[PDB]
């Protein structure tokens, strides 16, 4: 290369550079609350087709039985990427979701 | 970087920029009123739960004893993410459901 | 940004199009109908109440006087929500219960 | 169902003038066909057509 061209790159490289660029942003706790949420969401509704289904309180497992994401193991259910989880405490009448350590409570009547 | 090499950059930065992007806009005013509204439905139907618990018309707290998604504290419930409210005036027959300055009001007899 | 950035750029843009996306979709006949249906149950049961309170045959105004969620003007009830009307033919021993061109009719005598 | 300026209304990087939207530097256009419910969008004989139903 000539020494023209190796000056003009110098000063092109000094203007390239001295851009603005993103950082990079750990959004996980935004998106695992709306993960939670929306599987909140889920829960209500799998629930309230369950009372139909009972004919009356459901079980735990007639809840989980109306959720589609995931696969269940006795009073828990899982997305299907490990991550977020259901469960019941059934004798306290309470579903837990949680994803990352954002939680939700639902006090449903469930036996 | 060869002179090439940053002609070429010049060129596709020009290209990748100059695309649409979509603007960000505060959807919250139509969100908000599906929450009053869907809150609404909830109120309408614990009321009518209520009325059969009650054998005849019921109390502030017989109807909010029957919403699963918050707490109450006397003759007002609030939702666990506290901007969704509903009260009772009793002396009025009225519950106004309100969120982030979307409202209604429902005329169901109460005591 | 260096060329092999924008290389990258260019691949992944390709792979995030390119996906599924839903349409949107006009459900609000659907949705109509089944609030026509709700307020058809609606009327037959302020209709039934009514005919407790007139102790015979019940008026038109004895009827909407039972509705919750509208008001009404002379042998008409209108939703909060102007879109669902329900309106007396006392003459014809008739409602009728219409939304966005839904409609529905309950042959109930009434004066 | 939006109108072709509602969808329009929400793009920034450039302008409209009816029933089409162009990048800044124009080289880039949008173009709804309201009757056809279809968006077209193309630049330098590149192109692409999404079929979303508008008014
Ligand atoms: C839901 O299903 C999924 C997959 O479908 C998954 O498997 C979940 O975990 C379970 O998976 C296996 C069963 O399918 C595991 O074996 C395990 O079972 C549980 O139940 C066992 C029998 O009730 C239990 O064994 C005990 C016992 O028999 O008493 C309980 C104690 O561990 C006990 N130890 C002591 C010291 N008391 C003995 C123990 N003995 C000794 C001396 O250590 C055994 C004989 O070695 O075992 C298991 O311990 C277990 O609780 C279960 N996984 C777990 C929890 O490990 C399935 N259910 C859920 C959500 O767990
Ligand atoms: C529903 O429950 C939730 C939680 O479960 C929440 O706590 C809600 O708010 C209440 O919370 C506390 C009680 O649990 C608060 O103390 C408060 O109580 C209300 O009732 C008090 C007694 O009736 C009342 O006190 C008064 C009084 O005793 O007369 C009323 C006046 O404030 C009065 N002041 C004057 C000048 N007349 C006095 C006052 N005196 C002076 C000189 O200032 C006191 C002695 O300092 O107090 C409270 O004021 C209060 O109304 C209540 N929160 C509020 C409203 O602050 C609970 N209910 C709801 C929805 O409020
Ligand atoms: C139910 O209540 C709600 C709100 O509570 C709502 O107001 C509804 O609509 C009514 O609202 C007003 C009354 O509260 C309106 O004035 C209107 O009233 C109706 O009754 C009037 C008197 O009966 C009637 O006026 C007439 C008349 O007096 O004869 C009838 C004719 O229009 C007549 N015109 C002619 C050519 N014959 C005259 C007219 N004269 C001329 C030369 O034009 C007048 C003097 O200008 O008026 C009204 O016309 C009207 O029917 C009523 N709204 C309507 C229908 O416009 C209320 N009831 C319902 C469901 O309508
Ligand atoms: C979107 O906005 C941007 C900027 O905001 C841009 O301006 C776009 O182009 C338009 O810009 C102007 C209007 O703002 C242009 O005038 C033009 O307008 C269009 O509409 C005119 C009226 O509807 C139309 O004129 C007609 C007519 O009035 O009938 C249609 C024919 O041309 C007609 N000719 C004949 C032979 N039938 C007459 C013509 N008469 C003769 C004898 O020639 C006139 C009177 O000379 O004119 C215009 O022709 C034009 O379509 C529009 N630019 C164009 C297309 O030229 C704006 N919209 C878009 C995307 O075009
Ligand atoms: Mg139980
Ligand atoms: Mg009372
Ligand atoms: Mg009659
Ligand atoms: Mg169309």
Known sequence: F??????????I????????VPRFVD???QANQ????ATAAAVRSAYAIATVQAKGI?????VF???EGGSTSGSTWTSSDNSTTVSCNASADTFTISRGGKTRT??????
């Open 58 to 62: 459901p079980t735990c497992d007639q």
């Open 13 to 20: 490289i000094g203007i390239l550079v001295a851009i603005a």
């Open 65 to 67: 039985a109306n959720l």
């Open 106 to 111: 639902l006090n449903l009547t469930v036996n």
């Open 34 to 37: 709306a993960n939670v949420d």
């Open 2 to 11: 000539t020494l023209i061209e190796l000056a003009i790159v110098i000063v």
């Open 27 to 29: 959004l996980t706790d």
